[PDB]
Amino acid sequence: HLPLIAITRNPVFPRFIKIIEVKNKKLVELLRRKVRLAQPYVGVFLKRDDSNESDVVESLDEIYHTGTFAQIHEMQDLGDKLRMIVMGHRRVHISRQLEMVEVENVVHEDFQVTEEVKALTAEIVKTIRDIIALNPLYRESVLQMMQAGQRVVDNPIYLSDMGAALTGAESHELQDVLEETNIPKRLYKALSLLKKEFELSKLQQRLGREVEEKIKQTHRKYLLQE
Amino acid sequence: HELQDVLEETNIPKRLYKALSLLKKEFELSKLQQRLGREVEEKIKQTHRKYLLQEQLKIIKKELGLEKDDKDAIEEKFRERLKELVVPKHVMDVVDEELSKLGLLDNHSS
Amino acid sequence: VKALTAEIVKTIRDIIALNPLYRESVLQMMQAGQRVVDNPIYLSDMGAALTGAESHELQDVLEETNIPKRLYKALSLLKKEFELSKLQQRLGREVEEKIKQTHRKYLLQEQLKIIKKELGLEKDDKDAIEEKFRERLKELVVPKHVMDVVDEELSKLGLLDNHSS
Amino acid sequence: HLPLIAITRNPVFPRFIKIIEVKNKKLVELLRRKVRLAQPYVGVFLKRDDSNESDV
Amino acid sequence: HELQDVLEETNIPKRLYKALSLLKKEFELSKLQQRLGREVEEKIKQTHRKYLLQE
């Protein structure tokens, strides 16, 4: 029974550390009111299209039904007065956020036979390796800690979510991947997100090499003219 | 576990045949996945080429090296300057071609 | 009393690293951890030789009689050179980054044009005008003497860009 | 006659160079004690279903 | 022509000597072009670097 938080353009992918710094100070009152608790926590929800902070505080239907509840780790507040840490621990698809009642309706069907189902996983981490190699966003040390050979991925859905966090897909798209209920549908959608980034990247790369070689063809003949 | 089972076999034809059978099943799994993924990839390819050309359009727009604001202001300014005049055709077409030249050129060339 | 020497040799290594004047092999021959500095006055003088300080300054360093005073003055000289070196280095990177921001932004703008040059590769102007001249030309009982020029000039029009004078 | 190594989800196929990086520091004492040994060696084995380091 | 001339030679040390001479003669021409190219490039560096100084 806490008011929804004003996410204000802050996606919290499952099992991916994130920070929330809302500019309003009315949310700090709620963050300071939970410091008396022995186990403080915060919930994370996603916003709908045409974001609006005034509608988030006026009505509670703007926020999507999906939520990722988690516990806070620790406040720092070095520069601003609202530096909260968020995490994706318990995913949820609230039946009605307006009513607040909640239930962990985390559907997760998976085949018993997990032999053919991990061959695509090899391609997912390979696509992540090519996405971080051709489009490096974050460090590769997390990939060396959590290896493929060394099967220490106790939560594959979470590893896929952490890998999908590298995707540049719109927040809406993330909600759409969460909307998918079957596990192979969301898995292919995550792969689709990767491909959508991949197409643009390849376009940019071809365009860049083309312009650069044109510059080389320019200047090299100028060296010849010299 | 499967590796240990393949190692338990002592005779060479037995382990070789078991290894090949294991290769057959693994290749069958990888093939069905590669085909299902090709089908899904085709279902993603179903998105129209207009969207791709729209992507190139937004790529053009989302840049900080596009048409000069100063030139656009002069462009509209001279257009409104002509808006009300009983303009002869000669000056009209010459003004239009020169305005294109204005759009093309850099903001500091003489 | 030997604590100042450690900062003097670290500053001299930073002076030859950021402003390399002479080789560092003399610095490895006479190091501070192998009991190879039998003459500190001489080592300070040799270290002070790397300085670019004015002759006047050298005389000023000689005026000092006490050892920590001349060492401190030598340090002041070191700071004067260090100040000049860091100024030049920052200044150089600044000018170069201005050049990079120049050319790089031109690379982006160049990309913008190239992709907005042949966005639709249909010669909406070049071809329409050449074909236009052709049908307008088609019906006349033309001299062949002119056809040579018109066709080669058609090729030149196919080469040149539209905006060009 | 050496204690079993804590493979910890690391398959070492025969005649295939492999690297082992256990997080525990208890295996380094045995690795430092075999450098002084005349013949330095280590054995590699495979684990059964449902891996468990406490059972190893 | 030179290849045929090397074939005309019958002794083995004569063709070997000519082959070495052929190799050096081409190398000499190559090196002349290479020296000229690096020289032109160094001239360009001395050009532009002074422009960096003037700027």
A80 within 8 A of A21, measured Cβ to Cβ: yes
CB spacing of C111 vs A214 below 8 angstroms: no
For strands A41-45 and A84-86, give the pairing.
Answer: unpaired
CA dist., res. B24 & res. C108, Å (int): 51
Q: In this structure, are residues A64 and A46 in contact, taking their beta carbons and an 8 Å threshold? A: yes
Find out whether A93 and A177 touch, Cβ atoms under 8 Å.
Answer: no
Residue contacts between A and D (CB atoms, under 8 Å): 8
| A26 and chain C in contact, CB less than 8 A | no
Q: Which residue of C has its CA nearest to E54?
A: C95
Rounded to 10°, the helix B12-45/A183-225 angle is 80
Q: What angle is formed at CA A173 by the lines to CA A136 and CA B65, rounded to 5 degrees?
A: 55
All partners of chain C with 3 or more CB pairs under 8 angstroms = A, B, E
Which chain E residue has the Cα nearest residue C97? E52
Does the beta carbon of A140 lie under 8 angstroms from any beta carbon of chain C?
no
CB C115 within 8 A of CB A207: yes
Rounded to the nearest 5°, which phi and psi values hold at A84? Answer: -90, 150
Task: Give the resolution value in Å.
Answer: 5.6
- What are the chain B neighbours of C111 within 8 Å (beta carbons)? 65
Chain C CA closest to residue A209: C111
**Chain C closest-CA separation from residue E45 CA (Å):** 15
Per CB-CB distance under 8 Å, the chain D contacts of B1 are 48-49
- Strand (E) or helix (H) holding B56: helix B49-61
Cα separation, C16 vs C11, whole angstroms: 9
A 100-119: CB under 8 A from B: 115-116, 119
In a mutational test of the D interface, the residue from A114, A145, A146, A151 whose CB has the highest number of chain D CBs within 10 Å is: A151
